[PDB]
Amino acid sequence: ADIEAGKAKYESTCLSCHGAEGKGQAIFPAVTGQDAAYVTEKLEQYRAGEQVGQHTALMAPHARTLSDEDIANLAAYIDAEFN
Template identity: 60%
Template sequence: MKKLMLVAAGIVMATGMATAHAGDVEAGEAKYAASGCVGCHGPTGQGQAIFPKVAGSDAERLADTLTKYRAGETVGPNSAMMMPHAMNLSDEDIANLAAYMASLE
């Protein structure tokens, strides 16, 4: 019985953690507008000039990249421009932004 309760508790915790990292598209949209993402990636995330398209990208990849920028890691040629924008993002902000950008077409 004790084993069963531990397994059940583990499943509940894992489910809760997966939900927490899913991201809120509406909150991500608000953060995208407020954080200045629009200025470089465009209002619909299509990118412009040297700034890449983010619309429709994989949410997990976007979150990973933003997390690396926040940590000060070089990801690509625009890392120096992205790091200051990412450094104040919370895990929740990153999940929300990633969900929003992934939802764009």
């Protein structure tokens, strides 16, 4: 995985909700404390259009167009930066 590529994608597309340090602002889930496998699995679920939690509709649009490479890069960044 490419941590730098994941960082750039996170900063552009994810940070507004999940935070610069992954803590999730006031109401969005934190992405701290989770490894790359976990993040990969979750992003793949959202991308596939699975119902995850009660607020799937807020998150799913942000996963729908991710490639597998994107997912791997994001997951590597999140693990390195926030775990």
